[PDB]
């Protein structure tokens with residue numbers, strides 16, 4: 001009935017915004033610091049937030065966020081015999097991490113988690129674009145990001161240093177997670193002497209490849225406003241330019257999370273520029289979440305549908321593709337011998353050979 | 355496994371924004387005009403959108419929105435390249451009824467409105483900073499002051515409350531008979547008066563009075579058997595034989611609620627009652643409608659107004675007793691919705 005559906009539909013905006021608040025308050029990491037199988041109260045978590053130390057009401061407000069995440073199975077909820085054991089009312093339940101929220105705890109060794117990518121995809125710049133999503137259906141050649149912000153996303157990033165940082169860091173940390181999965185399955189880097197990352201962001205991806213395979217000379221290529229903020233990484237040379245004008249010569253190339261932002265004509269133009277800059281026997285690796293041939297209720301399907309909706313909002317022509325669709329782009333640009341390599345939950349390496 | 359959890363976590367922002375776009379495009383009503391049991395393609399739906407008629411790519415974009423909603427159990431998906439989409443129990447509640455246009459669309463458009471989402475961007479302020487209110491941090495004014503200067507937000511909020519009110523009262527009238535033999539009812543913070551219009555339609559001997567702020571009363575429609583009055587409920591309430599407070603107490607802290615309830619007490623006769631209509635926080639929370647029906651507004655009011663929160667039956671009784679009321683009768687209606695009578 002209506003008053004069942006109010007709950008099912010009304011919670012949809014609330015959960016991500018509660019999650020974003022919890023990530024910004026570092027709730028998950030604070031719970032993790034209490035140890036294995038920790039179950040802690042809002043009051044205990046708030047005690048570890050210096051910014052809350054003069055706010056008597058902080059724990060009660062925090063509990064209102066955490067109990068929604070508990071109801072949603074992002075946190076586990078429990079109590080104790082000591083709390084149970086008639087005229088006193090215990091409001092505070094105890095919260096613990098779940099499989100999903102463990103992925104929101106920065107790793108002790110290097111700080112990696114899904115936090116940075118999830119903070120990008122719920123950033124105000126992205127949500128403001130989503131408020132204009134209907135324009136793609138109504139208006140020929142409209143792009144929601146352009147309707148919201150008056151510029152395309154990569155042009156906007158060159159004017160807006162906060163957005164540039166959020167986007168660049170979201171891609172970079174997510175890249176680390178993805179390459180850990182790639183290196184467990186894929187052995188195609190072992191024989192390479194040089195790798196050029198085309199649209200490589202701040203260079204994190206090629207830094208990790210060179211760290212794993214130290215005979216590889218790494219080159220990172222991106223737009224001027226990205227290269228200007230890129231760190232110095234061991235074994236990585238940075239190159240600024242425009243991949244639709246000219247790609248540097250390299251023995252092998254990587255395109256990770258690049259083709260999915262662009263329509264077919266732009267993708268063929270870029271792939272022809274890569275072909276022109278590769279030697280005979282070179283290859284370009286495409287790393288993307290591949291759209292399954294039949295969608296279902298599984299991680300592989302959602303791993304493609306999420307960026308499919310984001311790129312529809314964020315850039316003209318951007319979309320997720322099937323293996324067949326990627327093969328067609330490579331073949332149009334002159335490549336032969338397409339080799340799709342499943343990695344994990346829809347993530348693939350697709351090799352295009354010159 | 356990070357790349358399993360990317361799907362579970364990354365879809366959380368995408369689903370509501372896809373849903374908002376589908377409601378703004380009137381997708382669910384367009385499917386329903388083929389028949390409530392119909393299963394129709396994106397191309398068939400787009401063909402019913404005049405704004406898309408010069409956009410060859412409209413259907414393909416629409417399909418990308420709808421397939422996410424189909425993966426999220428808001429639409430059914432089936433094969434006859436184009437998949438066919440059908441309504442579900444949830445999306446039937448997004449089809450304006452053929453009789454009167456009522457659905458959950460207006461309230462869901464309000465709770466995902468930019469003014470609300472911009473407040474939620476500031477939600478962490480309520481934890482860090484004593485006395486902050488996310489809405490105020492985001493907008494520079496409190497929500498009822500903002501509504502007075504922002505006609506679009508005023509409309510979205512008022513219409514969300516009003517249409518939601520109709521489905522709530524349909525549920526109330528199934529269970530609750532306490533309006534019978536009332537002769538006069540004052541709706542304190544009644545919005546644009548839809549609630550009292552529905553009560554007077556069911557109970558034709560009630561003289562209904564709708565009481566709200568000037569910026570709401572000046573946009574309220576004329577309803578049969580309803581008189582509109584503007585004022586400030588914290589200063590005084592008009593005399594009335596019986597009163598209604600629906601979705602009012604949950605916006606305010608305890609001291610403000612007791613002040614309002616004492617104003618109501620002063621304006622009631624001996625034997626009068628005030629009815630509180632709210633989603634009541636249950637004693638145990640879980641993954642169920644009663645729980646979420648309270649947690650959703652609890653989070654929204656945390657963001658939107660100082661002191662706002664959902665309350666248990668015990669907490670409501672404490673407010674009424676502090677204001678001089680001497681019998682509390684809680685009446686469950688549906689999925690956590692209650693009528694709570696406070697007797698003078």
Ligand SMILES: Nc1ncnc2c1ncn2[C@@H]1O[C@H](CSCC[C@H](N)C(=O)O)[C@@H](O)[C@H]1O
Pocket residue numbers: 154171172175198199200201202205221222223226241242243244255256257258
């Ligand atoms: N014309 C152009 N030339 C070069 N790089 C571009 C470009 N248009 C966009 N890009 C870059 O394409 C990248 C897409 S995001 C992916 C970054 C990285 N390969 C990773 O997988 O994490 C951005 O860093 C963006 O600045």
Ligand SMILES: Nc1ncnc2c1ncn2[C@@H]1O[C@H](CSCC[C@H](N)C(=O)O)[C@@H](O)[C@H]1O
Pocket residue numbers: 498515516519542543544545546549565566567570585586587588599600601602
């Ligand atoms: N000081 C005040 N005096 C009167 N009404 C007020 C007020 N402060 C807020 N309100 C009104 O309180 C209402 C809360 S929203 C609920 C409206 C209605 N009772 C319904 O259930 O649908 C708004 O219409 C708002 O304008």
Ligand SMILES: COc1cc2c(cc1O)[C@@H]1Cc3ccc(OC)c(O)c3CN1CC2
Pocket residue numbers: 117118121153257258261289302303304306307310311314315360361364
């Ligand atoms: C499964 O969950 C997700 C998967 C992916 C992204 C975000 C998710 O949450 C990001 C989103 C995104 C947005 C804009 C981009 O360029 C403008 C871009 O390259 C990417 C990369 N993709 C990689 C795949």
Ligand SMILES: COc1cc2c(cc1O)[C@@H]1Cc3ccc(OC)c(O)c3CN1CC2
Pocket residue numbers: 006007010461462465497601602605633646647648650651654655658659
């Ligand atoms: C279960 O889902 C929902 C339940 C409820 C609301 C919205 C939901 O989506 C709205 C949200 C809201 C926001 C602000 C208010 O005053 C400033 C207000 O009175 C209300 C009313 N409540 C009633 C309960």
